Ligand binder design. Structure first.
Ligand code: HEM
Ligand code: HEM
Ligand SMILES: [Ca+2]
Ligand SMILES: [Ca+2]
Ligand SMILES: [Ca+2]
Lengths: 674, 672, 356
């Protein structure tokens, strides 16, 4: 894919960057115990490179991971868009996708509670087209000019730089409560969408309304929705926290492993399509990025399949250096007057100068298009091209008038949708059509299941309880109360304040499909899900049981880890390094029961803690072999429990257990406010 | 002070651009109320351009870190051993800035990663800035600076997928260690409690290299810097460090910030070991070799002065992120040695600052400025903040009357290279054979730890090496560990189901040395700032009363008290939902709360009990104030560091003893 | 000087932009380009770029950040910093505001307004407003530059465009380059003139202070040095910058003939004690003293001989004694009074050939 740029070092002698064979292990010194010499160019070339390895992290979405893939169109979409990549059934275009958290620095944990990025580049035969989206369909703010306010508030306090990758501090909730537009995204982030099970188990959204533009000039309004084929799934908060410490790399490792095992994740790339006349028809403004179109109003149209199936060769060169822009647009697509989108168009082109340190960032391999470039851009630091045209100006006769101007009528040029207009005063004023900040947050809340609603309440209780300012806490209750009195009461109970009186201006009872995680039913596939088998080296029959279970589980593409006191043939991991956050279900072989009812080889009570944690976090758990009561009694897990299994037959154990893995979470183990 | 002049106050006033024009910054300028944004909106672009360019490259190593201001005070006139001005008078005060850090992780990684730690001190002296750029471990992994990128690439994440963050627990790191045996000494330190210190305040600082002290008369002696903590030595246990990394990635920087805010700024005695030049090879190793310590039994510590950190930064980015240390920031009275690791460092720091700052004028940032006049002919460069009056910036000149004047051993208090230093021999890329013993001092170190400490170290190695996928690498690791201690190799081999190689006694010995053991260093000299979690309940007026009684007592003794209950209210600090045992150094359950330890929508199932049990398993002082609680938690009433008293005052007294002991190590199983 | 970074975006309350598409795009360029020059986003902190009033905003960090900001809540809206900094606009805080009568209406277009389409009438207005000799200089600059263009097609295309401004210009230029001018095309021709664009027509200079007078003298005659000293005193009294030139330096001589050139002076005076130099030396190139005088005359400057004896110098130079801007007096006083009128006139344009 980027084969032309690969460098192989599987053989050969060390050389400088200019091909001179050298060594790099000992400095040149004036005598054997002498000082190092300035003339040692071997030393200086190697250390200079090392000294300059780092580049600025992205201003947001610093922490993330990418993979290569293919997009395949399901149809000829010419009848709605001139976009070349969508112009034929089965047409394939290479892609690169990067997923990320949003607030944390490089090296912060994947399983922070946060908005997540989902950025996709299509290397089309008419230019690179990027859709730079999030896993949440609405954004916090209604005007790009407010982005630094939002980001400053969410990022660590700037005196001490605390806390990392978290909204759980005063400044964030101060902003949220003073800028009520934030409520909708806030509710999404406080739901299980803020803590996805993996990048493969979340959807991607363009957020903004864009336009599809036909060759004839007619346009329609669209929203992009990348719908996961793996299904939707979340962690529970108290698992996400432990996982942040046990495996900061959880999401990037999950993605990397799925691709390597031939389970590359897939999404249906979809749009909602509506007429230009419907911009204000749905009870809100399609220019407002804090609003969704309910699927009951406009159904999803599937355009094609996105599949990620190839990991990068060098993370820095590919994932770190990929530079996405919403301004990377192609003929057939256009912008709308969404004031958040409008300002983004400026930001991405500008910020890449910061990251790259020079203007030629489009020439980096990962950023290059797959079709020829013909323009009069020249020079600049890091210029890799050697341009033959010595008359790089338009209009010219001395290069026969090339390159020629491309537009609607010639050379397949980009063109602005010709029906677009502007009218009015030049103003710094918010449209009153943007003013309802609360009805959609309530629509979202109403659409979650009872346990889902409790989890959202509990996320808010956790975070707001860490806000020191009594005034900020009260202000937060004021805003929450406008979305839902019941939310405000339940949150207030945790923080020892009174909720204010119900204000029903924005309350309503409407619901919408497709936003609940709990309500989206069992997972459509269990391939890649992780089963930890707790066993012991003290009983050769426990290992026999573990081996039989492994064979039967791996047959169905589950990723199996056998855990014992020490490593040996057939054991993957020791108890010392094992944790419940490492598994989607946990099985104990009854031969190992004694470990459950002290060792220098693992912390006290570790084998039982793995089982108890997994149970408490809602995972399918069980004992295989017939003798289950010693384990279940020690764990205080009821044998009759939903998602608790006990069979002597390995085949029968696995059949039941696999149903539990697809259910994924057993939500009856979590208490509800009365 | 350069920082006072550049402080910007925004507590009043209307918003302005960077050029002082009053503006707004909340709505974009548009062609009509639902129209597109205008290119002519300079308010928008100036604000967004700034935001777009806020980030700068992180440090190549020590990216995760935090800083504080303070003072250094000399104990004596040290002219008898050094010309250094900041050391030339009893009571002489010099401002300092210190930055502490982990070493391998990127700038958002957890404080409580297992790692070497940075301890970099700048003394803004009256003869120039002097930096001691040290670590919390006295020896380094490698013997030549040219190997640094090899070490660092191996320990940092694998470069195809950038996994794992802030961890040596992967194949490449152990491959490097097992192929480059000089690493063993530092590896042993990193695998001990020194890899997971309880806080920046509870670790020491070392200059690592041998340096020189140079007197005005030109004579020199060899020195090692040792900053000795007045807070005592303390570590986490590994399982606790893991949970902490998720619950509070900011634990160490918060611990430091808080200690300073409460008037408990941390202190170190700044010390040196001082030996004669003739002793460079007298101790059974080469003092140019940065993998060796001088045992304290061979050269005792001399206390030069007090280092105290007592003011937090105003802006983290401007001060902590932008501070740029250099071992080349040296002052008259100090010199380098021919340590090949030190030698190459001198080049690296000056060069790397170009990457971070993006221009050559990084010494003009307020945090990097000196507190004395600058007179030189350095000019221009991006970001030039001075307006130089001298229009003849060359030497020799007559047109500026020969100024600036040359400074040297005999003019203007100039820096001078120790005049006794020589070099002789071939120009070679060869390692001195005096550097070849990579295994005796790792053994010395291991011998000097207590039995439970040695077990913790074996268990750290068992943890990490079990995660290495390559059988070849694991075998090579056992080969090197075996040269240090056959017992260590046997015990770690046990966990990974390989057989250890046969004993090879070449480097074995039974020697020990003082001052390297954490557990063996006795109870903490102070318990001020240590954290007590009181587990209570809102359902009992008596429980809240009991909590409050304890609070007034413990707080008067300097302890930081957190009362935990189901919900916040008067006198309750944290909810059970946000509480964790990693948040405390000791845990107390009040009697009236006994019921919680037997379901609630206000916290996860079993949370109250879990905090108590985690605290006990991690060795902390735990207690009940007011038997069933100790029963539910399976905690022995007669256990060392388990407290049970009806008497408030009696409990606080016993418990405060427990906080000093800090860890009750009898709770951890040992190989036998 | 090198670090000053100007921007038309540096605007203040009371001024606003217009929809000139050239101006509109400049607003982007200057902010962006300073990143290239400065290498970092904090270029407004360079001393030459700093304002002379307080700065209150939430811009933060960036390479080279010189400020230490005390406000730890740099976001709007906030309560934790009491809502400061406050928003400034037309009604509060003397904020910048866009002229409120400004509007836009129409399609979003990449099209040129047809009102921009006349490219030729104003060039012709400008040309008409210059004096005859001025028009000759302009034709001569065009003849000079276009003659160096190698492509015959480009030269042809240039005459096509010039011909639309003025058939006469195209003809006169065409003559120098051996091509024929296109036939007259009078769409944009006219006879209108405008005030204030002509240099030659702007009358004599309002001041001669700082103008440069080179006095050519000799060390071979003590009398020449004396004349040069007296002239110097009389000229310096009026704020003129005087350079005395001779073969070698000594007290009262500023420059050698070797370094001197007519381009260094606004007027040139030979002292008659130095007349023999104007008829070889290892101390300057052959013919240098005379060449300074002749160049000065050819380039239209006031030139003269002071002392009373002028024919030897003037004849050697081929300069007519009665030409305008040519002076000859014995009296230093009378000489300077006449010469100073010539310095205000500045250029004697009757010395330049015109096309017929
Ligand atoms: C709809 C709301 C938004 C979404 C879904 C969004 C999405 C993203 C994503 C996914 C990335 C990381 C791309 C990658 O993986 O490299 C990103 C980076 C960035 N975003 Fe946006 N963003 C939004 C709003 C904004 C706004 C309003 C601004 C500023 C006006 C902005 C400025 C940036 C900057 C400076 C970066 C770093 C870009 C780079 O270094 O390449 N974002 N955003
Ligand atoms: C004795 C062994 C060493 C110790 C104790 C040491 C200590 C440190 C410390 C404490 C910092 C961070 C200072 C801060 O807080 O900003 C640092 C940064 C750095 N070190 Fe060293 N180091 C050692 C060896 C080396 C070697 C051999 C090289 C390369 C030849 C090196 C290159 C760097 C670089 C490039 C940085 C980032 C510096 C900056 O960005 O300002 N280190 N090291
Ligand atoms: Ca805060
Ligand atoms: Ca740069
Ligand atoms: Ca590796």
């Amino acid at each position: 894919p980027l084969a032309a740029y690969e460098v192989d070092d599987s053989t050969g002698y060390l050389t400088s960057d200019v091909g001179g064979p050298i060594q790099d292990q000992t400095s040149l010194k004036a005598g054997i115990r002498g000082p190092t010499l300035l003339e040692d160019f071997m030393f200086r070339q190697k250390i200079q490179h090392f000294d300059h390895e780092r580049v600025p992290e992205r201003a947001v979405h610093a922490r993330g991971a990418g993979a290569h893939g293919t997009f395949t169109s399901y149809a000829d979409w010419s009848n709605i868009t001139a976009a070349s990549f969508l112009n034929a059934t089965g047409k394939q275009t290479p892609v690169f996708v990067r997923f990320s958290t949003c607030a944390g620095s490089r090296g912060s944990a994947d399983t922070a509670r946060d908005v997540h990025g989902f950025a996709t580049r299509f290397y089309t035969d008419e230019g690179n087209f990027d859709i730079v989206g999030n896993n949440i369909p609405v954004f916090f703010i209604q005007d790009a000019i407010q982005f630094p306010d939002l980001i400053h508030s969410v990022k660590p306090r700037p005196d001490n730089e605390i806390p990392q990758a978290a909204t759980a501090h005063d400044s964030a909730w101060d902003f949220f409560s003073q800028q009520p537009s934030t409520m909708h995204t806030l509710f999404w982030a406080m739901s299980g969408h803020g803590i996805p099970r993996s990048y493969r188990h979340m959807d991607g959204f363009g957020v903004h309304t864009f336009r599809f533009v036909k060759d004839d000039g007619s346009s329609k309004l669209i929203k992009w929705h990348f719908k996961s084929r793996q299904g939707k799934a979340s962690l529970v908060w108290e698992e996400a926290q432990v996982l942040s410490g046990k495996n900061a790399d959880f999401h990037r490792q999950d993605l990397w492993d799925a691709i390597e095992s031939g389970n590359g994740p897939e999404w249906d790339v979809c749009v909602q399509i509506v007429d230009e006349s419907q911009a204000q028809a749905f009870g809100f403004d399609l220019l407002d990025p804090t609003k969704i179109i309910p699927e009951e109003y406009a159904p999803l149209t599937k355009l094609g399949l996105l599949k990620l199936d190839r990991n990068p060769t060098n993370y820095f060169a590919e994932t770190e250096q990929v530079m996405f822009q919403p301004g990377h647009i192609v003929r057939g697509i256009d912008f709308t007057e969404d004031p958040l989108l409008q300002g983004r168009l400026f930001s991405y082109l500008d910020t890449q100068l910061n990251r790259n340190g020079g203007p030629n960032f489009e020439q980096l391999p990962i950023n290059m298009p797959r079709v020829p470039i013909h323009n009069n851009n020249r020079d600049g630091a890091g210029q890799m091209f050697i341009h033959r045209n010595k008359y790089p100006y338009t209009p010219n006769t001395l290069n026969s008038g090339y390159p020629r101007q491309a537009n609607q009528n010639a050379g397949r040029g980009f063109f602005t949708a010709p029906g677009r207009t502007a009218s009015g005063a030049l103003v710094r004023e918010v449209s009153p059509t943007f003013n309802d900040h609360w009805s959609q947050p309530r629509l979202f809340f109403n659409s979650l299941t009872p346990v889902e609603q409790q989890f959202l309440v509990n996320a808010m209780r956790f975070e707001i309880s860490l806000v020191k300012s009594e005034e900020v806490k009260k202000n937060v209750l004021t805003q929450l109360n406008r979305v839902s009195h019941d939310v405000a009461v339940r949150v207030a109970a945790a923080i020892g304040l009174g909720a204010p009186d119900a204000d029903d201006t924005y309350y309503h009872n409407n619901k919408t499909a497709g936003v609940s995680i709990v309500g989206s039913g069992p997972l459509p596939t269990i391939k890649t899900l992780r089963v930890g088998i707790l066993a012991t080296t003290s009983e050769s029959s426990a290992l026999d049981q573990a081996a039989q279970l492994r064979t039967r589980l791996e047959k169905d593409g589950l990723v199996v880890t056998v855990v014992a006191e020490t490593l040996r043939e057939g054991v993957d991991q020791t108890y010392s390094t094992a944790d419940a956050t490492g598994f989607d279900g946990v099985v104990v072989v009854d031969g190992a029961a004694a470990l459950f009812a002290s060792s220098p080889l693992f912390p006290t009570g570790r084998p039982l803690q793995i089982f108890v944690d997994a149970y408490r976090w809602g995972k399918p758990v069980g004992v295989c072999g017939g003798k289950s009561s010693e384990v279940l009694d020690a764990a205080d897990v009821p044998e009759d429990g939903d998602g608790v299994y006990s069979e002597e037959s390995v085949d029968m154990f696995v059949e039941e257990f696999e149903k539990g893995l697809a259910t994924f979470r057993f939500t009856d183990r979590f208490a509800l406010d009365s």
